[PDB]
């Protein structure tokens, strides 16, 4: 029913190997040209990737900022409110970003803010101002 | 024949 385990004999390969006298030795050298091409083909792009790694030199060490070490608060200061109004102007409905700018508010509180002061901060107008970009 | 195989 099946060939010995590890022996690979497809119906199609037999026909391809026997097509003529030395058809098979052409198929075998073809794969040798293939492997030689694919083999150095690697070094060319191994070296490219190494060159790209070299422009990345140093990482992002002297760019990481002081930590956002501050405890969350339920109370809205006037300052904090204003920070949010501007964050709708810059970010739209990205409530996580707005929350991170303020720093001491949870995403839910920012959404809560958005509904109550929707009227008094004309936030609908602030959103569509952001949308125009 | 086969039977001759060493």
């Amino acid at each position: 029913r099946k060939p010995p385990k590890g022996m690979f004999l497809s119906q199609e390969d037999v026909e391809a190997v026997s097509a003529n006298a030395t058809a098979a030795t052409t198929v075998l050298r073809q794969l040798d040209m293939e492997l030689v091409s694919v083999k150095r083909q690697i070094q060319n792009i191994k070296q490219t990737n190494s060159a790209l790694k070299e422009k990345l030199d140093g990482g992002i060490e002297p760019y990481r900022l002081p930590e956002v070490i501050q405890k969350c608060n339920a109370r809205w200061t006037t300052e904090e409110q204003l920070l949010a109004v501007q964050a709708i102007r810059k970010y739209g409905r990205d409530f996580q970003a707005i929350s991170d700018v303020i720093g001491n508010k949870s995403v839910v509180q920012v959404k809560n803010f958005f509904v109550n002061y929707r009227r008094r901060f004309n936030i609908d107008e602030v959103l569509q101002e952001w949308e125009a970009e | 024949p086969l039977s001759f195989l060493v």
Binding site: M7, D13, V14, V27, L83, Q86 | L2, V6
Partner: protein, 665 residues
């Protein structure tokens, strides 16, 4: 076993009637199931009786004597069965003490060409049936392709060497009749490379496994994919092996291709990530400056200035996040690439050293069949395998020649008589033969029937060495041409000191190239006297026949010096080099199933020839020309026993034809 074992030993199904039995007992096998079982017992018992004591004739009277009821109640059956068994050489064959001395007068004249094993076996039988039998041998000795070098204490076979298992073998009987010292062959065969260094059990076992694997693979091609014809030409085992080897070398590369093909893809995946990582470090470098500058605006500040610091802060920490997550993916792709380059798949299928060792294994198979694998029928080369005997193989320690010489005794044999023409017609046969010593001097032999035991290679000769008048019908001559007749030679090296491993029966030698893989590839340590025996198989077989003995013996010593030491190997006292292909009375070693031939041709070889009528319109006559030999037997070709059984077979057929069958009436 017991009675059932007797049938087995006689190559017969114990619980069933054979096709030849149906032919002779068409009343019983068409009869009720009870009768058949009675028949089968009588048959099986009678075989047992003869087998238990093969050295004396087993008569009908002696058989009936030792039968119990109800089996002895039908004495016509017991007689019929016994006669059948005796006729077809299942009992009372070989060399036995005759109870009733040979019939007073002789019926029918039979000329047998050749006193090889088949020839003798038919001669001993036809004489047992009271016929007038004369054998015409071209050689100055009996045995034909069974030939033992005897000189002083040195004894070595140039022909048949091995008994391929006693289980079912008719030679098992003969070995109890004649003095045969049968020694078991220890199948442990160490291999040695070109330089003379042994092959490590690591390599040995892995290559041998691959050999057997490659063979099953060819069967898959033959049977499962029907790869049997290619460009009108029939596929040989040699070709199919190459196909399968190439398909394995192909796969080795395809696995390498798709592995590096997988590196380049991971190599790319990194590049795309790196470009993204560069462009992000660019924007982080920029966004840091914007943050830095906005931080310089010292407090107190208005809320839009405040927002700017806080906003640039968020925007920057978010981009730092991304870069750390992209550096995470960099590390993973980086080690994944060190994973793939660390361990590729298989480098090669078979190294130079691997292939050479595999080539030895082919040399073995080329020897087994006495022919380059490029000639063997892929489908049928092994057709005779199912009939292999049980038990371990043995060699004749005193030389196989004891068997022909034994059988020869008591027979009219004309040595040194080369049959030049066989003439068969309605009313009889004449055999035109010359004396081998003075060739222009002639003999004429008149007979009722001729048994031809001419080696296939002789029947193959062009121009014909023997001429058939009238010419053999095209069906017979096509059989002769389709069928393969191989070649295999032996170098006998007679020393007077054992420098080899005495507990080892045989050791191999690995040739440098495929071209010469069967050149002195195998050595036999078999005999009492310190004699080594070297095999020349495959293509090397034929080519070495053109090379002088000294050069051949030289190569043998050189090889042996490589294994055993430059000074451990003395000059042999006596050497012999066989050249079977060049030998006019064999023209090769033994038959094989060639590509384009099949197992059926072997049957065509056995099929007898009935001449045409003398007067036009006269009745179709009796069969005149008969064929026995190793090449005339589908189930045991190329073997001593095979030959033996053909002789036994033909004698029966001829006797039936000329003395009538009593056992069928």
């Amino acid at each position: 076993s017991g009675v059932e074992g007797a049938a087995f030993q006689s190559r017969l199904p114990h619980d069933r009637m054979t096709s030849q039995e149906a032919a002779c007992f068409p009343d019983i096998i068409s009869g009720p199931q009870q009768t058949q079982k009675v028949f089968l017992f009588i048959r099986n018992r009678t075989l047992q009786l003869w087998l238990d004591n093969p050295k004396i004739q087993l008569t009908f009277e002696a058989t009936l004597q030792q039968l119990e009821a109800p089996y002895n109640s039908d004495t016509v059956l017991v007689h019929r069965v016994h006669s059948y068994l005796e006729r077809h050489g299942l009992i009372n064959f070989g060399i036995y003490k005759r109870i009733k001395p040979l019939p007073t007068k002789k019926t029918g004249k039979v000329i047998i060409i050749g006193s090889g094993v088949s020839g003798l076996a038919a001669a001993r039988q036809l004489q047992s049936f009271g016929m007038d039998v004369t054998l015409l041998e071209a050689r100055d000795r009996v045995g034909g392709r069974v030939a033992t070098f005897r000189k002083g204490n040195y004894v070595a076979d140039l022909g048949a060497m091995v008994v391929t298992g006693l289980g079912g073998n008719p030679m098992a009987v003969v070995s109890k009749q004649v003095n045969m010292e049968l020694a078991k062959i220890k199948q442990k065969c160490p291999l040695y490379e070109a330089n003379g260094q042994a092959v490590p059990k690591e390599k040995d076992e892995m290559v041998e496994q691959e050999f057997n694997r490659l063979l099953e693979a060819t069967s898959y091609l033959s049977h499962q994919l029907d790869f049997n014809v290619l460009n009108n030409k029939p596929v040989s085992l040699g070709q199919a092996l190459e196909v399968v080897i190439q398909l394995q070398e192909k796969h080795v590369k395809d696995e390498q291709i798709e592995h590096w093909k997988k590196i380049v893809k991971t190599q790319e995946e990194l590049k795309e990530l790196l470009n993204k990582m560069v462009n992000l470090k660019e924007k982080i470098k920029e966004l840091h400056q914007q943050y830095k500058e906005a931080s310089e605006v010292k407090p107190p500040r208005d809320i839009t200035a405040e927002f700017l610091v806080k906003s640039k802060h968020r925007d920057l920490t978010a981009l730092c996040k991304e870069y750390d997550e992209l550096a995470e993916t960099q590390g993973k792709l980086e080690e994944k690439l060190q994973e793939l380059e660390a361990n590729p798949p298989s480098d090669v299928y078979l190294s130079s050293r691997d292939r050479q060792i595999l080539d030895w294994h082919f040399a073995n198979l080329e020897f087994a069949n006495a022919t380059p694998l490029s000639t063997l029928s892929l489908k049928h080369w092994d057709q005779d395998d199912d009939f292999e005997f049980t038990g371990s193989h043995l060699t004749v320690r005193n030389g196989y020649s004891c068997v022909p010489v034994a059988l020869a005794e008591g027979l009219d044999i004309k040595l040194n008589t080369a049959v030049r023409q066989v003439r068969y017609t309605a009313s009889g046969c004449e055999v035109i033969a010359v004396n081998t010593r003075s060739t222009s001097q002639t003999f004429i032999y008149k007979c009722d029937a001729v048994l031809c035991t001419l080696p296939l290679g002789v029947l193959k000769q062009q121009p014909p060495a023997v001429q058939f008048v009238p010419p053999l019908p095209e069906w017979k001559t096509s059989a002769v041409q389709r069928m393969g007749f191989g070649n295999l030679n032996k170098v006998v090296l007679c020393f007077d000191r054992v420098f080899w491993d005495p507990s080892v029966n045989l050791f191999g030698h690995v040739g440098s190239t495929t071209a010469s893989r069967g050149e002195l590839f195998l050595f036999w340590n078999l005999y009492k006297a310190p004699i080594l025996l070297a095999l020349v198989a495959g293509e090397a077989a034929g080519i070495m026949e053109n090379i002088s003995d000294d050069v051949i013996v030289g190569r043998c010593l050189a090889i042996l010096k490589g294994i055993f030491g430059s000074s451990a190997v003395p000059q042999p006292k006596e050497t012999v080099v066989s050249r079977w292909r060049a030998d006019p009375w064999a023209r090769g070693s033994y038959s094989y199933v060639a590509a384009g031939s099949s197992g059926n041709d072997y049957d065509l070889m056995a099929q007898p020839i009935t001449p045409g009528p003398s007067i036009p319109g006269a009745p179709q006559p009796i069969p005149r020309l008969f064929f026995a030999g190793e090449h005339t037997i589908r189930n045991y070709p190329a073997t001593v026993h095979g030959a033996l059984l053909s002789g036994l077979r033909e004698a029966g057929r001829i006797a039936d034809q000329f003395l009538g069958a009593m056992y069928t009436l």
